[PDB]
């Protein structure tokens, strides 16, 4: 199975770095912590960030029904869209695709879009779903993991990766922390759509697969579900876990023999460079090795699942096409989760 | 790789037909449907019940966050006790586990339990995790054919299924529709647990899993979302998609031999001897073959995606099963949808 030219597409509404300290500034004036917090975010380096909802409706909250009514009202109208230009790429029609594999954590819904989209897309009456909304900012990588397992499962198998994400709709106005008023700087909306054809495709190599699970870090990275809706809780420790991260991606590497991190593919995904940055010093690549990662989180900001799909939608454009160069398509989120992904790139 | 015997657990707090009717009369004494409702409710033969919190508790709304709190707690001091059993029986420890394949949809946490679990029951640090949410009643089948598919990837691979379910944590006082009332006599607690190794192990061997979608039916078996948590929502026209659907097991029984529509082992969970009876006709099959089935509503109520897991507990428990007779396993829940399973008995 290889992975093809991921489609993806963002909402018109921009949000700028210097807009998000005026707010930020605005809406916290009395915070004791404030020029801390405003320092952080700009020292993030995202410059814009999309959201599926004008400012000034974003940063109300009509409450978590209302919310996640805007979800799948957002969702019908724009993810059907993507999916056709990855369908496009990986040159297969609604019927080709045996399994989609849905991921989002910024709505809930069931059952999820999977119905109906096999209902309006056309698709094989057939298709198995896999929706995924437990797994955050690592569910990109997962979803390739697991479409991945199941083309080797099923070699003429081809999978629909579907990404979903609007973070500005868990936005919490009442969330006061440094943490909190951090992340409203860096997340954004966007949406990722991949198909992974095992009958030979033209993009990323299948090669090995792994997870990793950061011993006693569940709630580092994580939710707190209330009447609100879905309140995101980062510890400050996260970007730190680089460094007992570092050796799973080495451990796995190897057992590939690709094995070294002298590798010339990395498309990771990390919550701003802070963390990325950690992963090119503890794993000792190269800083602009994740080129591609930070263009998306300088552009996009973190649209959780999305990114490692964008940052490769991103190497495909400046395709240079190294033909069978190593590869490194991880996630990290919640658990601390890392889905890794290991793979050569194939032409034709 | 083959299914094995799957471990149940189901909480203390009984609450059986007739004080549920009682407490139905008692609190909506001025429903103008509270005759059509009782009737339905003790026609659906649900003898008994199994809630996690006692019925005074159960019954009042503390909100979603606490609500939610009560997920938790809950699912961490029982879901380990049962897991054992169940690695037990198949005859293991935690470490022959490949991956974690969670199911469940009365609750909501991120990252899911598999990652506590991963730690906690001292699972291998690399240990795949699968959390889904958003398939309902059809989870349990659905899991099982992911456990399938994976085992398919990798022969060496033994994968846990774990369906937790406390539908008594997502009781709405606020919804006063009959077929909400309805729900409210159904819907019991309990969770299932079962591996399903790809080498030894005795129980229902793999052989072809399939899934169907019924068409136009998204809204019919589904979640409203609100600051109170999910209501549930079900459309009186679904007893009767078991007609649409019967030709839907036919369809992929044939594609390996064994349709006909006659088969020497039957374990489907539908959602109340109302539906598995017209199953039991337009399958044009007894009735008693979904006797197991049938055991588990009668004696547990509707436990969601637990309930084909408890419903091959049923039949292990009796045993008598022909060592090579034909086998069905399958899960019917939000999207329409129906996952589907088609095995042959065996032992070691």
New interface residues.
């Given amino acids: 199975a290889t992975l093809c030219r991921p489609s993806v597409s963002v909402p018109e509404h921009v949000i700028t770095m210097e807009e998000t300290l005026e707010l930020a500034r605005r809406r916290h004036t009395d915070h004791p912590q404030l020029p801390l917090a405003l320092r952080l975010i700009e020292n993030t380096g995202v410059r814009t960030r999309h959201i599926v909802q004008p400012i000034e409706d974003t940063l109300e909250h009509p409450?978590?029904?209302d919310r996640?009514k805007v979800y799948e009202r957002e969702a019908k109208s724009r993810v059907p869209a993507v999916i056709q230009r990855a369908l496009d790429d990986a040159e297969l029609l609604a019927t080709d695709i045996d399994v989609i594999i849905y991921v989002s954590?910024t709505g809930?819904?069931?059952?999820?879009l999977t119905?109906?989209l096999?209902?309006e897309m056309g698709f094989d009456?057939?298709?198995?779903?896999?929706?995924?909304?437990?797994?955050?900012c690592a569910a990109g990588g997962a979803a390739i993991?697991?479409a991945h397992?199941?083309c080797?499962?099923?070699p003429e198998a081809n999978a629909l990766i579907v990404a979903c994400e609007f973070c500005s709709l868990c936005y919490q106005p009442t969330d006061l922390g440094v943490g909190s008023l951090l992340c409203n700087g860096l997340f954004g909306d966007g949406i990722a759509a991949a198909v992974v054809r095992g009958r030979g495709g033209t993009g990323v190599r299948l090669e090995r697969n792994?997870?990793?699970?950061i011993?006693?870090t569940?709630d580092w990275?994580?939710?707190?579900?209330?009447?609100?809706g879905?309140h995101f809780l980062l510890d400050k420790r996260v970007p730190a876990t680089m460094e007992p991260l570092a050796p799973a991606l080495k451990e796995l590497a190897g057992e590939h023999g690709w094995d070294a991190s002298d590798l010339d593919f990395y498309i990771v995904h990390a919550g701003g460079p802070r963390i990325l940055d950690d992963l090119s010093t503890f794993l000792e690549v190269d800083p602009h090795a994740f080129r591609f990662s930070r263009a998306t989180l300088t552009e996009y900001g973190n649209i959780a699942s999305a990114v490692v799909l964008d940052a490769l939608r991103r190497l495909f454009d400046e395709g240079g096409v190294e033909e069978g160069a190593r590869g490194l398509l991880a996630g990290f989120?919640?658990?601390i989760?890392a889905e890794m992904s290991l793979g050569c790139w194939q032409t034709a």
Same sequence: chains 1, 2.
């Fill in positions: 409450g978590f029904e996640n954590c809930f819904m069931m059952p999820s119905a109906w096999i209902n009456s057939t298709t198995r779903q896999i929706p995924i909304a437990q797994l955050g993991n697991r397992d199941f080797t499962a099923y792994g997870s990793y699970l011993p006693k569940e990275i994580m939710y707190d579900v209330k009447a609100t879905f989120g919640p658990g989760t």
